[PDB]
Amino acid sequence: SIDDLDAEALIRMALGPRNTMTSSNEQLVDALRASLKENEELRKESRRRADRRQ
């Protein structure tokens, strides 16, 4: 019964798994990109403080 399906399943029905897997991967890439930028910033902050501390 379609009433029992969640949004993810409805979307896949309408757009197909190639589309939904592609969007999932794009979003994962956006998330990982953001996380690695935060990693870069944390490392920069750490280096500045090591320098401050001598």
Phi, psi of 22 (to 5 degrees): -65, -45
Residue found under tokens 């994962």: 28
51: partner contacted, choices Na ion, a copy of itself, none (Cβ within 5-8 A by kind) = Na ion
Select the residue interacting with a copy of itself from 9, 13, 24, 47 (CB under 8 A). 24
Which residues in 34-53 contact Na ion (CB under 5 A)? 48, 51
Task: Report the nearest approach of a copy of itself to the CB of residue 47 (Å).
Answer: 11
Q: State the residues that interact with Na ion by CB under 5 A.
A: 48, 51, 54
